Design a protein around this nucleic acid. Sequence first.
DNA 1: ATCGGCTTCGC
DNA 2: CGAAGCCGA
Length: 474
Amino acid sequence: AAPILFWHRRDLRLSDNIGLAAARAQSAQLIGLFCLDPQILQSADMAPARVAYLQGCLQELQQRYQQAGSRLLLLQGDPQHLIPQLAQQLQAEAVYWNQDIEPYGRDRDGQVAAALKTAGIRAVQLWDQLLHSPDQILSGSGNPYSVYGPFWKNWQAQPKPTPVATPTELVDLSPEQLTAIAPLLLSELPTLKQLGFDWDGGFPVEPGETAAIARLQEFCDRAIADYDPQRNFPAEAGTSGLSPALKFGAIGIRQAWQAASAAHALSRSDEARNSIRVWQQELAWREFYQHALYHFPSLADGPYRSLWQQFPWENREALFTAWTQAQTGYPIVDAAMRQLTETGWMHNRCRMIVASFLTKDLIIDWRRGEQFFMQHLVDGDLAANNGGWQWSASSGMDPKPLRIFNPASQAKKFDATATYIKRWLPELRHVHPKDLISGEITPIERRGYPAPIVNHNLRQKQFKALYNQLKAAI
DNA sequence: ATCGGCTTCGC
DNA sequence: CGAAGCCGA
Ligand SMILES: Cc1cc2nc3c(=O)[nH]c(=O)nc-3n(C[C@H](O)[C@H](O)[C@H](O)COP(=O)(O)OP(=O)(O)OC[C@H]3O[C@@H](n4cnc5c(N)ncnc54)[C@H](O)[C@@H]3O)c2cc1C
Ligand SMILES: O=c1nc2n(C[C@H](O)[C@H](O)[C@H](O)CO)c3cc(O)ccc3cc-2c(=O)[nH]1
Ligand SMILES: [Mg+2]
């Protein structure tokens, strides 16, 4: 007799959704809900491309709920107060949602659940964004993994859950019920501008559930077979481009796994099978970092290891500015930074290259780079972004190798014809690939393009010195 | 507990 | 071919 509310946050789809399917099993009067949260939307680390993608996903989710039989309610404000209020005025029997791993989200959920319980309303929180929940993957000693290799061995051996059913034949709220909650609702989904953002840089995959599923299918039917080694070349469209869809849950993780598994089963070569397996390992890397953040929330605050907590970063603002403005004088680095600010996305090889460059060559606190990435990435995700940056600065629980990438080596290896470089640095197409890769461009040929802001070999030595020196004095 | 193994590499 | 010490079975 009472409606059940499903609260969407980062699972913007109707298909293969654990919490949603569970709620549907309890009632056909399943009403979706999304709460535009100022604490998230107005954070210093928000990207316009990310909000644009989100907004697009919400537009489709509203449509999907309408076709299913009910609707997606939209609220704006603090969910701790709005969600319980909505559930009460609606006399909802329960509120379902999928758990997250981020500190803010988990804290928020604790408050909402508590408020609901006090109101006598059931709050059900299920795991959905991961193939295996955090407490499901532990070492022999029953503790979380800090090393990927072992985590993967465990993770890959675990039986894989299959996609759940999409809810259908829903029952909408009555006109009276809508009247009772009207005061708490937004009449319409605000435009991107109304949310305080502007974006026309495009996306790696169009927003929404439909486009995410389409990309998954297309990727698994062709390109996935060549993932290894095509994944290493930024000039090639060798990766899935699904990152924002996985971040916001426009696609279910079980459906993604199923599609990759299917391609593997129908593969006719060891090369193809290897490529597909490598892509599956990337999905495991995603879970590794999410699990890590869940088990060790302090990771979000910075270096876990005492050594890196004391590292004497040079922090020359002029160098950071040059990095953010793609004016480093290092073509491969500048091209990557241009792709990021202009399109809200960066190939993984380049994310490693520019992160290494910022921390090792410019010797700037990686946390500055972490923030800048969150300010531009359409797929900006605390767990994965913090994981990537700490990896680049090698700041884990124990001493790890100094991963000092050589920009020229990287470019020669992964962009041998400077195709990617020329694509994002069109002003340098007249320069020979050889010089774009080495970074040695004659003054008259750079036509305004900056000379290298630092010397790699020299900076490499200066960084190692700082390191060893501290490793000694500590 | 000994010991294989440690995403992404430079030289 | 040493990675930085040490996780994980
Ligand atoms: C410094 C740095 C910052 C990063 N920031 C983010 C971020 O904010 N959000 C994010 O999702 N990824 C981040 N990455 C990881 C990786 O670069 C991106 O997931 C990838 O570029 C997404 O593109 P894709 O969809 O084509 O990838 P694919 O190669 O198609 O991989 C499929 C999916 O696997 C996951 N995945 C792949 N590689 C990784 C990885 N290394 N870590 C975690 N998940 C991975 C993603 O969800 C991705 O969509 C970062 C990496 C580094 C080195
Ligand atoms: O519930 C919400 N979740 C939003 N999310 C999803 C969240 O990450 C989610 O609430 C997490 O659980 C927070 O820890 C966003 C994610 C982004 O990357 C960018 C913007 C948003 C905005 C919201 C929002 O307004 N409301
Ligand atoms: Mg230790």
